[PDB]
Design goal:
The structure is cut from a larger assembly and holds chains A, B, C and D.
Chain A lengths: L9 E6 L6 E5 L5 E2 L12 H4 L6 H8 L3
Parallel strand pairs in A: 1-3
Antiparallel strand pairs in A: 1-2
Chain B lengths: L1 E2 L2 E2 L6 H6 L6 H11 L12 H11 L5 H18 L2 H8 L13 H4 L7
Antiparallel strand pairs in B: 1-2
Helix pairs in contact in B: 2-3, 4-5
Chain D lengths: L1 H18 L10 E9 L7 H14 L5 E4 L14 E5 L1 E2 L2 H14 L20 E5 L19 E7 L5 H9 L6
Antiparallel strand pairs in D: 1-3, 1-4, 1-6, 2-3, 5-6
The chains are: A alpha+beta, B mainly alpha, C alpha+beta, D alpha+beta.
The structure holds magnesium ion (17 copies) and zinc ion (ZN).
Chain D binds 2 RNA strands through strand 1, strand 3, strand 5 and strand 6.
Family (chain A): Belongs to the bacterial ribosomal protein bL31 family. Type A subfamily.
GO molecular function, one term (chain A): structural constituent of ribosome
Cofactor (chain A): Zn(2+)
RNA sequence: ACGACCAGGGCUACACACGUGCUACAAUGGCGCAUACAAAGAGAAGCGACCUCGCGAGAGCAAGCGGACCUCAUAAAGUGCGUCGUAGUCCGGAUUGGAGUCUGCAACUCGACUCCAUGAAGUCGGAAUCGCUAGUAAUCGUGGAUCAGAAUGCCACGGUG
RNA sequence: UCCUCCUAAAGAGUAACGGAGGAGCACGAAGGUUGGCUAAUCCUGGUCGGACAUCAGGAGGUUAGUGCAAUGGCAUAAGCC
C-alpha cells in the first residue's frame, strides 16, 4: 500500500453482548461494543420461528367446543 | 441506543425512544421498562449496556419490525387471495371498515382525481 | 363480532344440508340464502351458491374460509367505473 | 489472517473431500473483493462523491478509486469523463479482514436480515451482493453521517463453476438462506 | 295486480361538485398524579348501587327505587406539583392488522365500544364568506327524546367568561 | 478556389449544367520522447439504478477508435494513460 493517502488502520477490540470478544484491524480507532454478532444472531433459531403461518381450523376449534 | 436492529435517539426519554420501535407503543414500552426495572423519566443516555441488553431481551419477547411487517402483509395478502370483501376493498384501494365512499375516503383514495 | 360465549352462528337448515351432503358425499352446489352463516371446518371442499340479492354465486370452500361468513364471498354491488 | 488460516487448514481439506480434486491447486480460492458505489447524483455536487469516498475509506481502509464514465449517455445527463462512482479493490489480508468484519458484524446489523441469495453467482462462481445502507458498518458514526449511501460487494474467486463458489462460501458459513 | 306474503339484497354504491358539522394543526398547550365547585333531567320488559372478577369495554351475584329518599352520576374546563421544550413533536388522530365485549334470531355487505399495534393529511387555510352587542360570543362539560342496540345531529342544562 | 470517392477502360492522367460528400480550421498540447496499456457490442450477477451511468466475470476479437469529410492506413499500434 502507499504511505500517506490511506486512513489509520489499527487493531482494536470489539466485544459483544454475548461476550464475543474479537480483535480486528479497523479504522475506528476506539474500542467497539456490539449488540449482535454472527454467533448470537437469531439466524439459527429466530429464522426457524419466522415462517409463522398459524392454523385457521385450529384457531376455530380453539375458540370453543361443540 | 441500538435496539432490535435500529438506532434510538439518546436525548429523549426511555418510553418515547422505545416507541420509536415499530411494534411498541406507550403501553408496551411501560411494560418493557417495568420488566427491566427501568424508570421512564431517564434517558437512553446514562444507561448501562447491561440495562440495554435487558431492554433488548424484553423487546425480543414480542413481535417487531420485520416480523410484524411480514405478518401484516401476510394477513392482507391472505384476504387478497381469498377474494373476500375486505380483500376487494384492500385491492380497490377503498375503505374496509364500512365507511362512506361517496365522500371522505381520502385516506385510502389519496388526493383528488379530476374528471377530464 | 359475536361473543365467544354464544359460540358461532349457522342456520340449522344449512347445517342439515351440510350434514347430508357430507354423508352422501355429493359435491352438488348447495344454493343458500344464509349469507350470515359462519363457515365450519367440516364445510371445506364444498361448492355453495350464496345469494347476493339477485342470484347465487358459487363459492368453493377453503380452509382459510373458516372463520368468516358466507356473505363475504358474495358481493352485492357491481361496480366497474364511471368513465 | 484469521480466515486465511481457517481457509488453509479446514476449507481446503473440506473441498478436496467434497469434490475429489486431483490437485490442491484445483481448489477454489477467493481472489479479490470489489466495493463499488455508483454515485450518479454527483452531477449536482462533487461533495456527494467526495463524502461517499470518505465513508467507503472508513469501511475498507483504502483510499477509493474514483471511477468515471466510460462513455456519454443522455438518459442520465452525463458526458464521457465525468466522475460518476467510486470503487475499492481489496486483496490479501485487507480482503480477509474486511470479509471477516462483513460476515461477522455488518450482515447481522442489516435491518430485517433473513439471508442472502444463492442466485447471485454470475454463472462462474463470482458472487455479488448489494447493501442498502452503509450504517451496518460500525466505522460510520450515525450522528456524523447525513446521507444513506449504498454500495455493492463483488467477491471474485477462482471457482470455475457456480457451486464450487457456493460451497466455498458455505464453508465460510456465508449466510445464503 | 299499480293489491298481498316471505327470503335475500338495497336505501350505506363512488372518477367527482356543494352545503352543514366534528376533530385538529399545539406551549393561553399535550401528559401524569392529587384535588375543588354545578344545574336541569330520565327510570319498571326500567334505573341498576355495594362486593367480586377482568388491563378494558364489561361479566357474576345482587340491594334500593314508580323515586326532594334509590340509581343513572365522579361534572369538566379549573387549581397544585412534576414533565415535555418547538420538532410533523410525548401535537394530531385518520387509516389498517390482530384480539375482544354487548345488543339482538342474526352485526359479511352494514352496529357501537374496548385493548394492543399502526401513526395519513394537517404547521391556521385562495377567490370568497358567516355568526354575534352581555351572562352575549367564545369555550367547558351534563342530561333527555327517538331507541333492543346505534349521534360529531336535534332539544334542553349549568360552569368560566 | 481547395480536399475525398466513382465515372477513369488493373501504371500516371483523363471531360460533361455527370453521381455523392466536405474545407476556408483547430491544438502551447491534440507536438516530441520514454514507459506502460488495448477496443465496439452483447450475456450473467449486483443498493438506490432505470433500454442505457458505475462494479465483477464471460463471449467476442477492432464490427471501435483516429480533433473534422471521404478514401487509404493503423497492434511494433499512427489508437489510449
Ligand atoms: Mg413504535
Ligand atoms: Mg340516506
Ligand atoms: Mg397524543
Ligand atoms: Mg335514555
Ligand atoms: Mg379488577
Ligand atoms: Mg389540570
Ligand atoms: Mg405536565
Ligand atoms: Mg391510531
Ligand atoms: Mg405534511
Ligand atoms: Mg408548527
Ligand atoms: Mg341586536
Ligand atoms: Mg339507542
Ligand atoms: Mg488509373
Ligand atoms: Mg488504364
Ligand atoms: Mg467499365
Ligand atoms: Mg508508446
Ligand atoms: Mg449494470
Ligand atoms: Zn454478538
Amino acid at each position: 500500500m502507499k504511505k500517506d493517502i490511506h486512513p489509520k488502520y489499527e487493531e482494536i477490540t470489539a466485544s459483544c453482548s454475548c461476550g464475543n470478544v474479537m480483535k480486528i484491524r479497523s479504522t475506528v480507532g476506539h474500542d467497539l461494543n456490539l449488540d449482535v454478532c454472527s454467533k448470537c444472531h437469531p439466524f439459527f433459531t429466530g429464522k426457524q420461528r419466522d415462517v409463522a403461518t398459524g392454523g385457521r381450523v385450529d384457531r376455530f376449534n380453539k375458540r370453543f367446543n361443540i | 441506543a441500538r435496539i432490535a436492529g435500529i438506532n434510538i435517539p439518546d436525548h429523549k426519554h426511555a418510553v418515547i425512544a422505545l416507541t420509536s420501535i415499530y411494534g411498541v407503543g406507550k403501553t408496551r414500552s411501560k411494560a418493557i421498562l417495568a420488566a427491566a426495572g427501568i424508570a421512564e423519566d431517564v434517558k437512553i443516555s446514562e444507561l448501562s449496556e447491561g440495562q440495554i441488553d435487558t431492554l433488548r431481551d424484553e423487546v425480543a419477547k414480542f413481535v417487531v419490525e420485520g416480523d410484524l411487517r411480514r405478518e401484516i402483509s401476510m394477513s392482507i395478502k391472505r384476504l387478497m387471495d381469498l377474494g373476500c370483501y375486505r380483500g376487494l376493498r384492500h385491492r380497490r384501494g377503498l375503505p374496509v371498515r364500512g365507511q362512506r365512499t361517496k365522500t371522505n375516503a381520502r385516506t385510502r383514495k389519496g388526493p383528488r382525481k379530476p374528471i377530464k | 363480532p359475536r361473543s365467544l360465549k354464544k359460540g358461532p352462528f349457522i342456520d340449522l337448515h344449512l347445517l342439515k344440508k351440510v350434514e347430508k351432503a357430507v354423508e352422501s358425499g355429493d359435491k352438488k352446489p348447495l344454493r343458500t340464502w344464509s349469507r350470515r352463516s359462519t363457515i365450519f371446518p367440516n364445510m371445506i371442499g364444498l361448492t355453495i351458491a350464496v345469494h347476493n340479492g339477485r342470484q347465487h354465486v358459487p363459492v368453493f370452500v377453503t380452509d382459510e374460509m373458516v372463520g368468516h361468513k358466507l356473505g363475504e364471498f358474495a358481493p352485492t354491488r357491481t361496480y366497474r367505473g364511471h368513465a | 489472517a484469521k480466515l486465511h488460516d481457517y481457509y488453509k487448514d479446514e476449507v481446503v481439506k473440506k473441498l478436496m473431500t467434497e469434490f475429489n480434486y486431483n490437485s490442491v491447486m484445483q481448489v477454489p480460492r477467493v481472489e479479490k473483493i470489489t466495493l463499488n458505489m455508483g454515485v450518479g447524483e454527483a452531477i449536482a455536487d462533487k461533495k456527494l462523491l467526495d463524502n461517499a469516498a470518505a465513508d467507503l475509506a472508513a469501511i475498507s481502509g483504502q483510499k477509493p478509486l474514483i471511477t468515471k464514465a466510460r462513455k456519454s449517455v443522455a438518459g442520465f445527463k452525463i458526458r464521457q469523463g465525468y466522475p460518476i462512482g467510486c470503487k475499492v479493490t481489496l486483496r490479501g489480508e485487507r480482503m480477509w479482514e474486511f470479509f471477516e468484519r462483513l460476515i461477522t458484524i455488518a450482515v447481522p446489523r442489516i435491518r430485517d436480515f433473513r439471508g442472502l441469495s444463492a442466485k447471485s453467482f454470475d454463472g462462474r462462481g463470482n458472487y455479488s451482493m448489494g447493501v442498502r445502507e452503509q450504517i451496518i458498518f460500525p466505522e460510520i458514526d450515525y450522528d456524523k453521517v447525513d446521507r444513506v449511501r449504498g454500495l455493492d460487494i463483488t467477491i471474485t474467486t477462482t471457482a470455475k463453476s457456480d457451486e464450487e463458489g457456493r460451497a466455498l462460501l458455505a464453508a465460510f458459513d456465508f449466510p445464503f438462506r
